[PDB]
Nucleic acid binder design. Structure first.
Lengths: 192, 192
DNA sequence: CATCAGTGAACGCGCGTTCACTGATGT
DNA sequence: CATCAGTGAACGCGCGTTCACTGATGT
């Protein structure tokens, strides 16, 4: 229908809030009014799309989750090959961040600093990412010296490193992060 | 003098802002009014201590920096012994966090989410921590296969891991972080 | 008597939310 | 005529900041 325009306006509010953040400001500090101002609706017109700012926040988590998971599926598609696994996936990853700066900006900025339902939605998307990593590694016996409990700890260290590297990939890398993921992988290989 | 009372009030504003954060809220979202309300002065009485909220933020970075560096000096004091280096220092560290929850809370929460001068003051304290780590490691030839450029990358990975572990050490560990730092150390040892 | 940390009233402003509304889309 | 996304005016409230002030500390 032309409730496609309703959707286009919802994307405007969303894209407007993310973009308003690219200046160091956090999602909790954004007013409904300024977001509507930026997106091109009069304040009360926010309520046709979200009940409040928190709800917009939640929709921003879902948007980035979807993008983050699409990238990791691309990385997952390359792990069945042999050699150069790290370099190739760092590249796939860095491209996806490049192509979606403001989404990963939101995630990097809110990963600890948001409201409650936003902190929780992020912790959740992160646990899934971590569980998927532990399941990838287990599948291909890529870390044989590591049992289920150890893989969980390993995958947590890798995801943590990635999440903690996001801020660096937006403000201003490839070789450095690759170098760093190697230290971790080497540590998993020679474990014991 | 009894400008010791002036200092006591300054500590109240400071401790008041940190503590007001323990509920998931970020420093940028705190009003001058609520901080004064919490600390026990009437709003305009903030200005005898700080020109604005940013300046309070800056003083909170300096406070935690000082505490963080005192902990790392304690960890540094144990690195000249042999064996069990990781376990002992994780313990020293976790105690210092325990003893200063709200300070590390501020740091963990603002490490990426604050204003500009606050983001910059934190990046600075972090670079110093990282440089000190790279200098410790170099001093004791603890990572012989690593040249100056490699140590910088290694120390960045360790500090990043620590900073990224802070949120977990306040909201709700020892074995997990120790386990994780081992993967990293092993990776540094067997590098090449 | 001198200093000055903290007071208490006042201001103008942007906020979130409500409400009856308008007018194009889709029957 | 029916739906409903977006309008525009209005409200009460908490904000940051100013100002002349008070009264204990320290001369």
């Amino acid at each position: 229908p032309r409730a496609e325009q309703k959707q286009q306006t919802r994307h405007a509010l969303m894209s407007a809030a993310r973009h308003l953040m690219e200046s160091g400001r956090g999602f909790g500090s954004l007013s409904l009014r300024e977001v509507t101002r930026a997106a091109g609706i009069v304040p009360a017109g926010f309520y046709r799309h979200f009940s409040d700012m928190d709800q917009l926040g939640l929709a921003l988590v879902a948007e980035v989750d979807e993008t983050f998971r699409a990238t990791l599926r691309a990385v997952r598609r390359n792990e069945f090959e042999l050699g150069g696994l790290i370099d190739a996936s760092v590249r796939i990853f860095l491209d996806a961040v490049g192509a979606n700066r403001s989404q990963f900006l939101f995630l990097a900025r809110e990963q600890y600093g948001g409201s409650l339902p936003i902190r929780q939605a992020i912790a959740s998307l992160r646990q899934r990412i971590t569980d998927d990593l532990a399941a990838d590694l287990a599948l291909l016996n890529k870390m044989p010296h590591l049992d289920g409990a150890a893989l969980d700890v390993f995958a947590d260290l890798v995801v943590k490193t990635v999440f903690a590297t996001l801020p660096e990939l937006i403000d201003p890398p490839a070789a450095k992060i690759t170098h760093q993921l190697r230290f971790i992988m080497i540590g998993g290989k020679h474990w014991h």
